[PDB]
Amino acid sequence: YTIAALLSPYS
Amino acid sequence: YTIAALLSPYS
Amino acid sequence: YTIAALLSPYS
Amino acid sequence: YTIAALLSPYS
Amino acid sequence: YTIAALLSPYS
Amino acid sequence: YTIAALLSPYS
Amino acid sequence: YTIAALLSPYS
Amino acid sequence: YTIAALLSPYS
Amino acid sequence: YTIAALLSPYS
Amino acid sequence: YTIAALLSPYS
Amino acid sequence: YTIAALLSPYS
Amino acid sequence: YTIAALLSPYS
């Protein structure tokens, strides 16, 4: 399989 | 609040 | 020939 | 889960 | 505060 | 699948 | 399997 | 002549 | 899931 | 007999 | 299956 | 007598 995810949650 | 979540469950 | 197979895969 | 299976294959 | 919760999740 | 979650966030 | 055979060949 | 033969081949 | 099977039974 | 088969199953 | 037979009976 | 026979049975 192939997966690419980016998450930059700021407060 | 701040939340970031990713889930890619495969069978 | 003779064959008997059972499969109950759950997610 | 619950599973019940019986197989009596004869030649 | 007052909170009451019950959870019995079965597979 | 089986999931059970409870959240009561107060300010 | 099940087989039953009889042969009495005379000359 | 006299001949008697039986063959029951199964797969 | 992923499955690959080949069968060439001859008599 | 003659048989030729190729299988490249990926997940 | 494969079979080859030859018979030349003379009297 | 004279007899000539050839058989090449392949599977």
* Quaternary organization: 12 chains of a larger assembly
Q: Report on the biggest sheet of chain A.
A: none
Tell me what portion of residues of chain A adopts beta-strand conformation.
under 5%
Intertermini distance of chain A = 33 Å
Identify the overall geometry of chain A: rod-shaped
Subunit structure (chains A, B, C, D, E, F, G, H, I, J, K, L): Homotetramer. Dimer of dimers. In the homotetramer, subunits assemble around a central channel that can accommodate two ligand molecules. Interacts with RBP4.
Family (chains A, B, C, D, E, F, G, H, I, J, K, L): Belongs to the transthyretin family.
Function (chains A, B, C, D, E, F, G, H, I, J, K, L): Thyroid hormone-binding protein. Probably transports thyroxine from the bloodstream to the brain.
Subcellular location (chains A, B, C, D, E, F, G, H, I, J, K, L): Secreted
Q: Could you explain the architecture of this structure?
A:
- The structure holds 12 chains of a larger assembly.
- With 11 residues, the first copy, chain A, is largely without helices or strands.
- Helices cover 0% and strands 0% of the residues of chain A.
- The first copy, chain A, has no helix or strand.
- Chain A is rod-shaped.
- At the G-H interface, loops of G face loops of H.
- Chains A, B, C, D, E, F, G, H, I, J, K, L: It is found in: Secreted.
- Chains A, B, C, D, E, F, G, H, I, J, K, L: This is Transthyretin.
